Design a protein around this ligand. Structure first.
Ligand code: SGU
Ligand code: CA
Ligand code: NA
Length: 293
């Protein structure tokens, strides 16, 4: 595990997407932008994304899909009314910077705080909703699936505590969602693309005072979850076994993504230190649809 700092002075980095050339496109939630970090050290702003760009994934159209949580109040906190503009799913042209809003509601219900997302092999899009905190109450968590072609959005999970990281198993027959305040990883069986069958179960619950953020899946099927408070990556086997915890040096470790040769480099956002780092990983990551395969 040779650790290297790839970029600093990032304004709450999140949603890293590691390109084939080893460049990283990621979100800066606090600076409300999508940023490109190159291996020669240089950085460029790809697009301004007003609100709270929170997670990213490259889509089948070659555009970068964004979970926009609508904005926080700044370490993030509950958004004062004016700092919140509504949650949405958006799309950014990585060549022009054009931002288009795709969904801001499901049925008659506005999206609250979209957080992270993952494409299935047909181009369908899974995403989590962390909800928003208000003065005296908070939204429940949820997970949604947008049908291939961006034709329809559906609610698949609803009524958990806030949900954050999301991924698919290698065979894409299981969707994983990380429940933030409990440090529990939930697994949901899929009867087919975009459809949970009964709705799921927690396969791992960490002890102590540990919370979960975003995640990335390994080719082995292990789920690698950014772990807040204790500041590490928690590697969880498909059967729920805690395989290992890799310290990162930041209590606000928020996301991980695999790239580099054989997808054996982990790219991690340390959102407390404002850093993007890279770390050797003993096992290869799961190739993401429309990015790595
Ligand atoms: C504190 C929450 C909001 C952004 C995050 O990284 O998903 O975690
Ligand atoms: Ca997240
Ligand atoms: Na990730």
């Amino acid at each position: 595990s040779n650790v290297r700092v790839l970029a600093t002075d990032l304004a709450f980095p999140e949603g890293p997407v590691v390109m084939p050339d080893g460049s990283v496109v990621l979100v800066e939630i606090r600076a409300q932008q999508l940023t490109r970090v190159w291996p020669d050290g240089r950085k460029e702003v790809v697009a301004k994304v007003p609100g709270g760009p929170n997670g990213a994934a490259l889509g089948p159209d070659g555009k970068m899909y964004i979970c926009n949580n609508g904005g926080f109040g700044w370490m993030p906190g509950a958004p004062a009314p004016h700092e919140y503009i509504g949650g949405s799913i958006q799309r950014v042209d990585l060549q022009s910077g054009e931002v288009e809003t795709l969904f801001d509601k499901c049925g008659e219900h506005p999206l609250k705080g979209p957080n992270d997302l993952v494409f299935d092999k047909h181009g369908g899009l899974w995403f989590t909703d962390l909800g928003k905190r208000r003065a005296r109450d908070m939204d429940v968590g949820a997970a949604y699936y947008i049908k291939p072609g961006m034709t329809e959005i559906t609610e698949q999970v609803f009524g958990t505590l806030p949900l954050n990281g999301i991924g698919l198993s290698p065979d894409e027959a299981t969707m994983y969602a990380a429940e933030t305040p409990t440090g529990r990883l939930w697994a949901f069986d899929l009867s087919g693309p975009g459809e949970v069958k009964p709705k799921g179960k927690p396969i791992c619950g960490l002890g102590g005072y540990q919370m979960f953020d975003s995640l990335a899946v390994e080719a082995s099927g292990n789920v690698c979850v950014a772990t807040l408070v204790s500041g590490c990556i928690s590697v969880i086997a498909p059967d729920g076994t805690l395989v290992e915890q890799v310290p990162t040096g930041d209590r606000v470790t928020t996301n991980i993504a695999f790239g580099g040769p054989d997808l054996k480099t982990a790219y991690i956002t340390l959102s407390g230190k404002g850093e993007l780092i890279a770390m050797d990983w003993s096992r290869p990551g799961l190739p993401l649809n429309f990015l790595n395969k």
